[PDB]
Amino acid sequence: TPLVHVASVEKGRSYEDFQKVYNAIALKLREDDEYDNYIGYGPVLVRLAWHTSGTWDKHDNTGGSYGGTYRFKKEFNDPSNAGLQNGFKFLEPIHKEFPWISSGDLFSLGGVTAVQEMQGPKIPWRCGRVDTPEDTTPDNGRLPDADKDADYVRTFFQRLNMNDREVVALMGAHALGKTHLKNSGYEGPWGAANNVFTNEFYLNLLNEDWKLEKNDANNEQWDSKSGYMMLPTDYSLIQDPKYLSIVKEYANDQDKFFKDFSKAFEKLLENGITFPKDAPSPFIFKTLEEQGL
Numbered sequence: 001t002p003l004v005h006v007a008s009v010e011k012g013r014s015y016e017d018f019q020k021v022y023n024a025i026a027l028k029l030r031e032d033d034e035y036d037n038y039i040g041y042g043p044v045l046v047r048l049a050w051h052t053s054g055t056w057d058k059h060d061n062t063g064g065s066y067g068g069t070y071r072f073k074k075e076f077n078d079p080s081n082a083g084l085q086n087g088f089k090f091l092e093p094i095h096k097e098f099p100w101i102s103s104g105d106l107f108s109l110g111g112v113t114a115v116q117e118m119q120g121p122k123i124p125w126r127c128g129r130v131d132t133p134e135d136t137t138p139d140n141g142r143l144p145d146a147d148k149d150a151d152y153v154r155t156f157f158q159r160l161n162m163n164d165r166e167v168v169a170l171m172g173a174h175a176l177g178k179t180h181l182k183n184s185g186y187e188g189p190w191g192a193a194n195n196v197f198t199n200e201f202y203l204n205l206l207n208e209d210w211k212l213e214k215n216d217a218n219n220e221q222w223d224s225k226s227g228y229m230m231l232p233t234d235y236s237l238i239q240d241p242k243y244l245s246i247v248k249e250y251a252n253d254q255d256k257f258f259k260d261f262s263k264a265f266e267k268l269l270e271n272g273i274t275f276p277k278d279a280p281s282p283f284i285f286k287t288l289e290e291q292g293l
């Protein structure tokens with residue numbers, strides 16, 4: 001008895017209404033730019049979109065972006081979600097300004113906005129997620145561990161119906177932000193431009209000299225002389241032959257990377273959702289830069 005999650009457009013809302021919401025998140029991103037040592041809220045919003053969508057199980061259509069369940073205690077308090085309360089706080093004010101948007105919509109849209117606003121590809125986005133009751137919240141334990149190898153990553157992602165190319169594309173969001181010891185027991189950034197969306201992840205993996213070290217939390221991570229880090233799961237991409245080939249492809253073709261991430265990210269955010277033939281087409285949002293704002 002796999003569940004059916006039919007999208008329904010917030011009563012009488014259209015492109016223009018979502019565009020305003022994207023703009024609000026966007027303008028707040030610009031303004032509140034001191035967070036995390038001038039990283040800004042971009043990366044944390046991308047993560048919040050991933051963790052809200054990454055609970056999905058293709059087997060029974062449980063979890064995923066549809067119900068916006070991260071708003072319930074059990075999910076909010078998942079040890080895997082440590083740190084995301086920062087992104088939740090950021091969006092609160094926005095949700096108060098636009099009370100008609102579903103929680104799943106807002107969490108998803110905040111990930112889309114951050115990406116575009118950090119100079120990433122355009123991500124087509126579909127509205128219609130509907131808030132579901134507290135008893136629909138998935139148990140803790142569906143997000144991935146970071147101290148594992150290629151075979152774990154691979155297997156983990158099958159649950160989300162993601163193939164090798166989609167997994168490699170997705171992990172390139174690791175160009176953004178950093179790990180924080182207090183959050184995950186990992187420490188440091190993946191690269192230098194932590195708030196600009198590029199293929200820097202792949203470049204870094206192939207080009208830096210990594211050294212297996214142990215951090216203040218007693219966890220092993222790959223460290224570079226330039227000051228970057230790799231999680232064991234990041235480094236696993238150059239350890240597996242199938243992964244490594246795609247890693248090299250995205251290091252040598254920025255355009256290809258953007259296009260594949262856009263596809264996979266939209267797909268992650270849409271998994272588990274049934275869109276009637278009657279539903280509007282995906283919206284492409286203009287950035288502030290394109291609006292002259």
Ligand code: HEM
Binds near residue numbers: 231
């Ligand atoms: C094997 C899968 C993955 C694992 C194990 C992993 C693990 C991690 C960990 C441990 C952190 C640091 C949390 C903290 O200390 O602040 C992190 C940060 C982050 N993750 Fe991943 N992640 C994975 C996949 C992804 C995917 C698929 C994306 C999105 C498309 C994503 C986006 C990010 C972002 C943007 C950050 C930076 C957050 C920040 O600066 O606050 N990750 N991830």
Ligand SMILES: [O]
Binds near residue numbers: 047050
């Ligand atoms: O993550």
